[PDB]
Amino acid sequence: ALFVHRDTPKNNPETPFDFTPENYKRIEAIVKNYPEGHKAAAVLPVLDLAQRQNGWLPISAMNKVAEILQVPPMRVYEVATFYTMYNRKPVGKYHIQVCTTTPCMLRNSDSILEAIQKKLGIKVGETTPDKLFTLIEVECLGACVNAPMVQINDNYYEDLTPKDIEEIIDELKAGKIPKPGPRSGRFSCEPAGGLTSLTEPPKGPGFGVQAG
Amino acid sequence: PLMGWASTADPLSNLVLTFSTKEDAIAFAEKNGWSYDVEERKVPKPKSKSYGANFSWNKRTRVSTK
Amino acid sequence: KTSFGSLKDEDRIFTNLYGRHDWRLKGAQSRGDWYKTKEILLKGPDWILGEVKTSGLRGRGGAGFPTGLKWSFMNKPSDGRPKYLVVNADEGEPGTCKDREIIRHDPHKLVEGCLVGGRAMGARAAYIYIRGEFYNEASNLQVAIREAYEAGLIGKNACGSGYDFDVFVVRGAGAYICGEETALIESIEGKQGKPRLKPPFPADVGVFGCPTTVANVETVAVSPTICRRGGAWFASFGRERNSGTKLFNISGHVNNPCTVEEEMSVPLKELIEKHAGGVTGGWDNLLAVIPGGSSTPLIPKSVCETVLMDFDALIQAQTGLGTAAVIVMDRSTDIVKAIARLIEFYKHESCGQCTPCREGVDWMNKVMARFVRGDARPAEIDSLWEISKQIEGHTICALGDGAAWPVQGLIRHFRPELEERMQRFAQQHQ
Amino acid sequence: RFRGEHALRRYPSGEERCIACKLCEAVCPAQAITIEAEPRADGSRRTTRYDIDMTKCIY
Amino acid sequence: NTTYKNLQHHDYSTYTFLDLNLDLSKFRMPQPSSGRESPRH
Amino acid sequence: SNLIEVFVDGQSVMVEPGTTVLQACEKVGMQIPRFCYHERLSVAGNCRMCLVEIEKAPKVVAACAMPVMKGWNILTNSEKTKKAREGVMEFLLANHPLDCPICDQGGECDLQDQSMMFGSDRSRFLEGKRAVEDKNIGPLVKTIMTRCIQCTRCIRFASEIAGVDDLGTTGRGNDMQVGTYIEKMFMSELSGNIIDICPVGALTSKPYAFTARPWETRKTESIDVMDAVG
Amino acid sequence: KVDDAKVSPPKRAEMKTSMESLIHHFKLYTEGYQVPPGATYTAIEAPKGEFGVY
């Protein structure tokens, strides 16, 4: 949405932004992994470090990465506008992404969306009239074999219901983040019924190998 | 000056004659009498373009965008 | 010869579906990894290539191509340009869940497989590309690679003997086209997500120009087991062309949707019910079956009652194969709405290089929305068939094809349901 | 549908309907249409001169 | 066994990935170059 | 002596190895229609118009950037070649606005000529027709990015001849704005050359903009002045 | 008219709401439709007689 900057101060460089010299040591590690002659390959990890340090990246951050990695700025603007993570708009301390496409909608994501909606108050896409509760529904995150799923910042949540929704929301309002594991039993990605996996502790190297 | 037009006293100004070869062109222009100037033909020179060299390794040829 | 083959214990490829007694380099050591690998990696890469072509590995991730031919493309005489092994780890195709479990429980077998591949084709470094959605599991892979470096087991002087091999975990930024073969390669380069034209192959010009290759995590994970275990142990499970074990997983409408291994062929009803709970409401309650995940047309009940889950069997059933949504869906749902949300997925995650997939997925998403509300005549649904014929095969990558196929399957099977929907809207308007 | 007077039209409660897109001058077999265009301060494209030779016009 | 053997990833904060990547930048081969340092320079 | 035979419509001709199919067709006289190929820039493959049915293969392949194997047979006038061209031409004309009266390339379009000589005669796609808000690139070049077919030719020209690197693709799906992000007045040398690069009426001349239409003018030989090269 | 929109112009409603109809209208009325080469003769019975056009 609205992929032209439209300057709007609290943007419009130079907005005050800078890294840490410890983060410069991080950037030395990042452009030490990659082969010499192709320094421009680390734009995406360095800009990811910018998104992890500052809450949302401004145009000043992209200009600073253009200063560091001595590329033209326009390719940095391309890569930052292309992907999903790099929210150029400001977001909150906590960023709800409700994954719902084909199996997640088929496992009743609508009560989940309405529970988030009427417990939080604000509609999807936009934010809350404070911080920490921006909300988007997203495409496939990776854990399809469970409930229509919740991503918060670097964490997942599975096996949902509106009272679990109220538990997670009340414990984020109290700050006490729960474990990122699933709910309602099945403590891993498991067949939650009658243990169809192997039962014996596997031996390993003792049984059949050849020419080793 | 009555309508803002472009009149001219030039009947021969609005001709064009399409020919198949320069040889019959010069033969016709010397047959019919009037003096003439002949230019030559310019073609696109065949280059050697390749996508794989557009994604090179140690050359300076690099698309930097794609 | 078997009765199509079915699951057999203790010949599973990996252990630790979830939480076996240990997790460490010592954990994989007691579970039987890094065992006698020095003589394996000192024997010679032609032995690995011949062993792979002997076992007959089928390329995963919806490939349909063998791994042996690709890794025989990788044996170019070494120029000044190095060779790279890039392991794809994205999970698009909603209903995939495939290598999340491997990279969450056993990273050491991925380290096994990438070292076996790099020593066994003349490669030099392994770039492990992980999805940007995978922070915790990515740092689990990081800690496992720290432990492998802490033992000094990989890196320079691999297995003691004089060979260097480094592994670099590169994250993504959230994409689906990076899950493909070559937009992957340019997303490593620092450019944005863009696939490349095919006839210069990544086998000759790749990551910045390295003659490199791309492998999927199931092929990487089976690649040490094929070497350290015997020949035709892996090839005795299924048919002649395809043989091996695949992660058959169910996410949909069953009791306890979950992930298992099986062999290459299975009765699909026995797979769905007798391994993962049971179908919600009985076997008659289902509306349709999808194999493949999301890049594969649907299957009705009368077809799926005899479908064995082989590649050639599903090509004879005019579909493809994949993972984790090999499922049914209930009669109580709008299959038009499910397919239309899948087309919204294909719109929301696709680059806009090629004009035909861009504009065709635009028409298909707007037309599927209009058919959710039923706002046309059947000439429009056959026009949707016509555009889904014209999109396919005129693209750079296979995402246009994967967007073309579900609409094709719907128009193949459920013509009268669309007729009745549009007739109900005709009754609604008048 | 009689073919008479050569009168231009304009928009409902609006400005001039023409564009100076020269299609009428291209199709005019007598070549009686003569158009010179300039755009104005509004940004939209317009004219300056639009002459019909009623002597030449074959209707 | 019927016990969760992970949750060593429960304490992974927002910097630990690149902290680990900084901590694993030794014993490394020198990343062999190709002529120049960049396509434009 | 380093020559490969291609059978363009059965007619054999010798081609230097490594060059494209399209230069072989231009050697024998054929013009496979093209939108993202140009004979001065790098060869991207984003327009899909250059397709051709090469025999003994079920898949139509491109000819903008195809290397030539030994002994081809090229069909430029087959059935599914024409079907692919009509399909791609019907795809292009969906999200392109009705501006052919007011567009500044009435006589010098490319969608118009190739839509006549290869395209369909009826349209579809009743709804839709997205619209991109324009920019203000410079007082020299008038810019309406709605007519932009996202063909990636101004980008390749800028980044490979101008060297300025102020143009880019932004976004995904239909929403790929080709332009400049930071509202910067793109001013460089050779920026006047970009209004002939753009094959559609998306990057036109600002002071010229609405003063003629290219069938009324007549074209005349002349020599460049105020520059030493001419 | 014919259903051949590169030879006869399309009608007004589809001209106002299409894309190819406006393109065919525009180039058909500027250039005229291309005509294959050759020399034809025909003649019909005008009331004076063999009206021939070559």
Ligand SMILES: Cc1cc2nc3c(=O)[nH]c(=O)nc-3n(C[C@H](O)[C@H](O)[C@H](O)COP(=O)(O)O)c2cc1C
């Ligand atoms: C549309 C599309 C989607 C893909 N999705 C995935 C995916 O989710 N995960 C993956 O590892 N590879 C994915 N791939 C890549 C394939 O697995 C491909 O075969 C890979 O580059 C090499 O796999 P192989 O081991 O069979 O050679 C995808 C490719 C395409 C064209």
Ligand code: SF4
């Ligand atoms: S088919 Fe579509 S998604 Fe694939 S490369 Fe072309 S534009 Fe991108």
Ligand code: SF4
């Ligand atoms: S120039 Fe002629 S055809 Fe064009 S809008 Fe004006 S009157 Fe109509």
Ligand code: SF4
């Ligand atoms: S570029 Fe202009 S003349 Fe060509 S199709 Fe588009 S609007 Fe019409």
Ligand code: SF4
């Ligand atoms: S502005 Fe013109 S040249 Fe640039 S991508 Fe768009 S259509 Fe192509």
Ligand code: FES
């Ligand atoms: S579809 Fe929701 S997790 Fe994959």
Ligand code: FES
């Ligand atoms: S010329 Fe544009 S695709 Fe080949």
